[PDB]
Design an enzyme around this catalytic site. Structure first.
Site, PDB file in Angstrom:
ATOM      1  N   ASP A   1       0.747  -1.062  -0.101  1.00 48.76           N
ATOM      2  CA  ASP A   1      -0.075  -0.018   0.011  1.00 48.76           C
ATOM      3  C   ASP A   1       0.774   1.324  -0.192  1.00 48.76           C
ATOM      4  O   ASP A   1       1.256   1.894   0.881  1.00 48.76           O
ATOM      5  CB  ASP A   1      -0.771  -0.155   1.309  1.00 48.76           C
ATOM      6  CG  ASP A   1      -2.165   0.512   1.021  1.00 48.76           C
ATOM      7  OD1 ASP A   1      -2.198   1.465   0.304  1.00 48.76           O
ATOM      8  OD2 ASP A   1      -3.151  -0.018   1.958  1.00 48.76           O
ATOM      9  N   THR A   2       0.895   2.063  -0.870  1.00 53.49           N
ATOM     10  CA  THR A   2       1.419   3.249  -1.203  1.00 53.49           C
ATOM     11  C   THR A   2       0.749   4.172  -0.233  1.00 53.49           C
ATOM     12  O   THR A   2       1.244   5.255   0.030  1.00 53.49           O
ATOM     13  CB  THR A   2       1.827   3.635  -2.539  1.00 53.49           C
ATOM     14  OG1 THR A   2       0.742   4.165  -2.972  1.00 53.49           O
ATOM     15  CG2 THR A   2       2.384   2.591  -3.281  1.00 53.49           C
ATOM     16  N   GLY A   3      -0.432   4.118   0.060  1.00 53.15           N
ATOM     17  CA  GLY A   3      -1.220   5.120   0.663  1.00 53.15           C
ATOM     18  C   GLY A   3      -1.704   4.905   2.465  1.00 53.15           C
ATOM     19  O   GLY A   3      -2.730   5.189   2.717  1.00 53.15           O
TER      20      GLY A   3
END
EC number: 3.4.23.16
Lengths: 99, 99
Positions: free
Chosen positions: B25-27
């Site tokens: 997850d980049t967020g």
């Protein structure tokens, strides 16, 4: 661009004749933007993450500009603290994870 | 590995003696794993997502093997649906977001 993940991978989008900053997210299936003026037909929907389901409105055949990238996709409007670009759009501007 | 976003970027991880599958997850700033047998002392901090506010028990200095890649860090254990790998660890296997 090569976005290194040292900081939140924020990025300027262009929707509604509007300028905003959004969070590039590989963990969102869907693009969810915070409340704003948008025109056309909308549609009830529901999504949740950590802590509860939230009600957003569906809007299809919509244009969006990501870091100088054009893309027509479904966007979802609701009360999210940050504006999230999910995989429905990230796939479109050519974006891949790389390690 | 070059990873495209056509499908949810699930990857495998070896943690606390066991084999799991996590979402990259980049967020997400931190890793938040599904409730499992983790050995050690923890402190329970609370996290915020689009859902709402879930309670977790953090654990510092845990070793995590990600898509063959070694890294040591803070993991969050908790009421989550999918194991998440935030940037606290992705900075570490050296992953960038391309396009």
């Amino acid at each position: 661009p090569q976005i290194t993940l040292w900081q939140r991978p924020l990025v300027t989008i262009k929707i509604g004749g509007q300028l905003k900053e959004a969070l590039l997210d590989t963990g969102a299936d869907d693009t969810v933007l915070e409340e704003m003026n948008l025109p056309g037909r909308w549609k009830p929907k529901m999504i949740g993450g950590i802590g509860g389901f939230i009600k957003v409105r569906q809007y299809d055949q919509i244009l969006i500009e990501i870091c100088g990238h054009k893309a027509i996709g479904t966007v979802l409007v609701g009360p999210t603290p940050v504006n999230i670009i999910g995989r429905n759009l990230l796939t479109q501007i050519g974006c891949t994870l790389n390690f």
